[PDB]
Amino acid sequence: MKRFFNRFYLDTGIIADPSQRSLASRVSAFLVQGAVAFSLLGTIGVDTSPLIAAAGVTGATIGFALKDFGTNFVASIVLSGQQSIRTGNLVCIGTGLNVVKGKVVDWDTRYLYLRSSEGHLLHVPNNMVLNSVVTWE
Amino acid sequence: MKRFFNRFYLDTGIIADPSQRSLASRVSAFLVQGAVAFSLLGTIGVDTSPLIAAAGVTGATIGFALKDFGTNFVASIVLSGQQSIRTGNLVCIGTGLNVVKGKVVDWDTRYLYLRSSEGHLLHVPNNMVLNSVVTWE
Amino acid sequence: MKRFFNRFYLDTGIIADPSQRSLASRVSAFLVQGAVAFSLLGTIGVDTSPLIAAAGVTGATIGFALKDFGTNFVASIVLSGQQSIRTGNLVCIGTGLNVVKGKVVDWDTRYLYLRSSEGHLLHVPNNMVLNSVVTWE
Amino acid sequence: MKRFFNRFYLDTGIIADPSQRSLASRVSAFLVQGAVAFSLLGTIGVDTSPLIAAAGVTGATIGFALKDFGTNFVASIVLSGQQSIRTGNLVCIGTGLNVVKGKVVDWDTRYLYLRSSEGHLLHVPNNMVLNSVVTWE
Amino acid sequence: MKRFFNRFYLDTGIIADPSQRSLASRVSAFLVQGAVAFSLLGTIGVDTSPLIAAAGVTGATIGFALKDFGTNFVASIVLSGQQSIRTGNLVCIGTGLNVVKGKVVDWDTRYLYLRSSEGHLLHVPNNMVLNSVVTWE
Amino acid sequence: MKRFFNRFYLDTGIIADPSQRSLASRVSAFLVQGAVAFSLLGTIGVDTSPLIAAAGVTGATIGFALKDFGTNFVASIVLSGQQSIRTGNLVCIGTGLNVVKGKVVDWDTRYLYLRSSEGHLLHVPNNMVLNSVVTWE
Amino acid sequence: MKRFFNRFYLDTGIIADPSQRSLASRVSAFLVQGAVAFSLLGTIGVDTSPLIAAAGVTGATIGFALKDFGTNFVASIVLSGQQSIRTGNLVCIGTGLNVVKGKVVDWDTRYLYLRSSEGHLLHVPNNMVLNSVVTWE
């Protein structure tokens, strides 16, 4: 099932990095196998309420822990295929005192790199880029 | 069922982009078929509690991840048919220091494009347009 | 049941717009018929846990998506029958830098229209009008 | 049961307005009768899981929609019997730039009316009065 | 059971006001009797799912409504036995522009009374006193 | 079981104050005995759904009420064994206008005491110390 | 199972500190053994609903209490393998008035240490480093 999940993530374009793709495929395969094993164990008569409760609590805790990284990855996926944010475009993010000015040099799944006027490298999180006034000159 | 969902989204006007419409139709059809298969499997006697718990946890996590994009799409759908926000209207969004001034040029489902006085293209998220003082001159 | 729901929304005064009233009546009738059909299907023995879980997840996601519009509609309903906010009253909303000044010209279920001193049309969301210091001169 | 609920709300002092009291009594009576009917229907064998799920989802959505009005009403109920906020007392609410100055003239369940020095009528929400530094001169 | 709850709240020191103590005792006794009656009704065979769902929804709504008052009461209970906040101590609460300066005169379960330099009576909520920099001179 | 819980809290180092330790031990012992009694009552056939629902609602309400105190205690436990925050260290907490300057004199589970330059005693909550830029000179 | 969990945390790289690794391994082993014992007890017929409810409530309360520490640890894990934040790099975190300037000297799982120009040691939480504009000179 690992190969099937790898192919699915490759085709759907959710994850492009090979290492992240492999990790996600392994995690998904393990989760599916665990769910199937729990269902099979519950079919024959063995109680599964404590196991389900513990698994759900742990999964909810882990998901709440990874909220920022998940939001950043979702923003990176959504912002893909945007004409304004392209290498060589002098973009400007933010309104008021919290302003960011520079030129796009590279895109990542956790940060957006902008080259300042003095040469400093700015790491703007994609979540902040999503919920802000993006000005393209 | 894919064709039926495509027709429903076309008629109801929730989604107008053909690619987004096709993707939503495929996702909805897959979800409905999965729910029907799970119900059928639970009918004969096979336990479905772990499968339901895992599916619900994953769905909740994904839905919480896509909160910003969902809110933006809802704002884009709601703001449709508004007289103030039309091409050629010199609108002004925001009060205080966080002010945005320009002329509407194009509307998207993720951004609202305003042409500044100097020519810079402003990308105002529709969610911010919803919860702000919109001034039309 | 559509006619009964239409009459109920008309008499209770929750929704006054005919199009919104018809849409709400259709949605409510469909939801009630779906719930009755699901209950009938569960009565005879067919499992309904996956169907209920999927329906609840989808309903919760949609309800969370429409939070801003729902809040605005609730504020519009509540603010009805207020003496301060009436056509021709020079109201003033907000304290500090985020101040709004003008004369009320028209009321909507999504915006409150104020005519500025220079003639600009202000669209103040009803939710912001609810949770702010409203000054009537 | 409507008369019993009306008497209970009258004696307990939660609601004093006759129209609000009648509306709350009718809503409570309808809810209790619906719950009893659902319990009776579930007693004989008819499945009630879809009905309970739909009713709970709708009730949660409506309760979340009315959060601001509920909070304002609770603040109005709690602030009752306070010596500082009485007609003729030159109170002052807020610290910093968001300050409100005036004399109390009337009290409502949704707003607190203060007469400014120039004669403008201020409508301070009771929720803001609860969570603020109230200065009485 | 009312007397037992009254004695328990008196000994545990959670509530000291006789009227609040009596009200809490009555509410707790009613809740316990209702829970026992519901359990007894469910023991013999009568369905209790709709009753439990309605009671839980109503209780959750009421608890969410009273969040501010509950937080204030908890802060008042916790801040008890603090050396800094005592009658005659020139305390100072807040940092930056939102500063409060005065002398403690009396303590309540909803407000903290400070006498300003000019004689104005300040009502600082206990929740704000909990989460702020308290400066004692 | 009270002695066992007291020993466990003593060894694990979560609670060091003897009075808090005794109170926590008593509460934990009572909760465990109540849970065991409820499980035993449910084993023989007596319905426990209303009792479980009421207990869960009350526990959730109480836990949400004590959120600030719980967070402060957790911050106090976590910050233990930190070299920067020690008696005699001229620490500085906060950035911008909300700055706090002084010397550490004593540590508590609810406040952090700093001696100002003029002699005023500052009570900085541990939660604010956790989520702030701590500057040690 | 303690050794297996220790090996798993060592290989997966989630926890590198030996003491934290041992504590996490012990906690995970205890939780798994408790869940298995509860499932076995529920298999034979003994009711487990009160035990599951109490365990879930306690686990949720503890998880909500440790939210800040969990977020900080997740940020520390995610930020690993970042080129910008390395010893000897003059980084700058924050935009506007809340700015932090210094040179990275050491990295921890709870704080990020920066050496100021005057020699003061800055403790920037990793959570704030995640959601901020990181400027590398």
Author numbering:
A (entry chain F), B (entry chain G), C (entry chain A), D (entry chain B), E (entry chain C), F (entry chain D), ...: 1 to 137
Which statements did the authors publish about this structure?
Trypanosoma cruzi, the protozoan parasite causing Chagas disease, encodes a miniature MscS ortholog (TcMscS) critical for parasite development and infectivity. TcMscS contains a minimal portion of the canonical EcMscS fold yet maintains mechanosensitive channel activity, thus presenting a unique model system to assess the essential molecular determinants underlying mechanotransduction. By combining electrophysiology, single-particle cryo-EM, and all-atom molecular dynamics (MD) simulations, we show that TcMscS forms a heptameric channel with a central ion conduction path, but indeed lacks the side portals shared by other MscS-like channels. Strikingly, the presumed two TM helices are of insufficient length to fully cross an intact planar lipid membrane and thus induce drastic membrane deformation surrounding the channel.
Further examination of these TM3 kink regions allowed us to identify a point mutation, TcMscS C66L, that demonstrated higher tension sensitivity and sufficiently abolished channel inactivation in excised patches. The distinct inactivation processes occurred in the wild-type and mutant channels motivated us to also determine the cryo-EM structure of TcMscS C66L, which, surprisingly, was nearly identical to that of the wild type (root-mean-square deviations (RMSD) of ~0.4 Å for all Cα atoms, Fig. 2d). Thus, the structural basis underlying channel inactivation in TcMscS remains unclear. Nonetheless, these results demonstrate that the TM3 kink region in these MscS homologs critically regulates rates of channel inactivation and recovery. Moreover, the identical structures of the wild-type channel and a non-inactivating mutant, C66L, indicate that our cryo-EM structures unlikely represent an inactivated conformation. Inspired by these simulation results, we experimentally introduced the D47A mutation on the non-inactivating background C66L (D47A/C66L) and measured the activation pressure thresholds of C66L and D47A/C66L relative to that of the endogenous EcMscL channel. Consistently, the D47A/C66L mutant channel maintained the same unitary conductance (448.1 ± 11.5 pS, N = 5) as that of C66L, but was activated at a higher pressure threshold (PMscL/PD47A/C66L = 1.95 ± 0.51, N = 8) than C66L (PMscL/PC66L = 3.70 ± 1.24, N = 8).
